């Protein structure tokens, strides 16, 4: 999930936007 | 600011800034 993608690995705008409403 | 390791409050802040009025869901577990 988001922690595995953005915290324990390097985040990306692409990924963050997957979590927007 | 988004292309780095972002944990805890730093991740929430990035979601806030990116998503704007769309809002977001933060599910760490």
Pick B26's closest partner by Cβ from A2, A13, A17: A2
Assign residue B4 a region (left: φ > 0; alpha: ψ between -120 and 50; beta: otherwise): beta
A9: which residues sit within 8 A by CB, 6+ positions away? B5
Distance in angstroms (rounded) separating the CA atoms of residues B4 and B2: 6
DSSP state string for A1-21: -HHHHHTTTT--HHHHHTTB-
Are A12 and B3 in contact by the 8 Å Cβ rule? The answer is yes
Method: X-ray
Strand, helix or coil for residue B13? helix
Pick A12's closest partner by Cβ from B2, B22, B27: B2
B23: which residues sit within 8 A by CB, 6+ positions away? A20, A21
Q: Which sign, positive or negative, has the C-alpha torsion B7, B9, B14, B19?
A: positive
Name B24's bridge partners.
Answer: A20
> Residues B7-21, buried b or exposed e (16+ Cβ, 10 A)?
eeeebeebbeebbee
């Amino acid at each position: 999930g988001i922690v595995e993608q953005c915290c324990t690995s390097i985040c990306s705008l692409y990924q963050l936007e997957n979590y927007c409403g | 600011f988004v292309n780095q390791h972002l944990c805890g409050s730093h991740l929430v802040e990035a979601l806030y800034l990116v998503c704007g009025e769309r809002g977001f869901f933060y599910t760490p577990k």
